[PDB]
Amino acid sequence: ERMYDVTPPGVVMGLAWTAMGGSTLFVETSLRRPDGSLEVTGQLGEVMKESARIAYTFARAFLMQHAPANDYLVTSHIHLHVPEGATPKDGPSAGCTIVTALLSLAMGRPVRQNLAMTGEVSLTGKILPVGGIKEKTIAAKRAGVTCIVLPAENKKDFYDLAAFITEGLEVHFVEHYREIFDIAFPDEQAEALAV
Ligand SMILES: *[B]([O])([O])[C]([C][C]([C])[C])[N]C(=O)[C]([C]C1=[C][C]=[C][C]=[C]1)[N]C(=O)C1=N[C]=[C]N=[C]1
Numbered sequence: 001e002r003m004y005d006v007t008p009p010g011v012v013m014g015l016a017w018t019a020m021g022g023s024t025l026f027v028e029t030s031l032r033r034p035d036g037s038l039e040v041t042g043q044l045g046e047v048m049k050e051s052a053r054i055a056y057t058f059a060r061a062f063l064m065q066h067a068p069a070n071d072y073l074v075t076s077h078i079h080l081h082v083p084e085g086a087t088p089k090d091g092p093s094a095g096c097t098i099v100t101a102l103l104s105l106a107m108g109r110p111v112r113q114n115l116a117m118t119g120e121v122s123l124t125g126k127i128l129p130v131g132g133i134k135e136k137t138i139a140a141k142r143a144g145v146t147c148i149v150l151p152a153e154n155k156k157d158f159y160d161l162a163a164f165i166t167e168g169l170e171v172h173f174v175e176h177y178r179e180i181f182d183i184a185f186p187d188e189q190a191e192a193l194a195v
Contacts, residue, residue: 134161
């Protein structure tokens with residue numbers, strides 16, 4: 001089972017691993033009040049806290065180019081949480097997940113359902129390779145993930161898995177956050193008609 005079968009805005013599924021295997025986790029974000037700020041909870045280590053700062057800065061910049069009239073990330077007091085509360089978590093691979101959670105919250109739009117992602121985020125939005133792709137992918141498949149987004153340089157790790165694991169997985173290998181944004185929010189890049 002999963003902690004969220006259906007993600008509302010501000011909630012994105014990420015992927016973690018330990019020496020004991022892989023798991024899914026959800027990044028949760030929310031307002032704490034009507035210059036902004038980010039408060040972060042979830043027993044995060046120092047690499048993960050820094051990846052939340054990087055993601056926060058990039059998301060502010062990304063959404064000032066995609067939606068300059070939208071100030072929600074610049075002015076709001078945001079809270080970011082990664083359950084479960086007692087479990088320690090660390091590492092950079094949730095960067096894109098955090099970016100997506102913040103944009104999802106600021107746009108008031110949920111991300112594509114049954115989607116998980118992992119990837120380190122650069123300050124300019126480059127997606128850097130991560131560890132545990134095999135364990136994270138198995139965990140996604142067990143959790144009902146149908147769409148998985150991974151750093152492009154982790155492609156060989158993904159295809160080291162047996163076919164019966166990756167069959168049925170729609171996989172996207174990405175290098176810049178813009179590619180994730182268009183998978184996560186397909187209606188922001190979809191064919192439209194005027195009336
Ligand atoms: B990602 O690989 O950076 C990811 C980020 C986020 C999903 C937590 N981090 C991990 O998957 C961590 C989880 C963790 C758990 C407890 C304490 C620290 C980190 N795992 C690893 O970094 C890791 N797992 C197995 C073997 N080596 C390292």
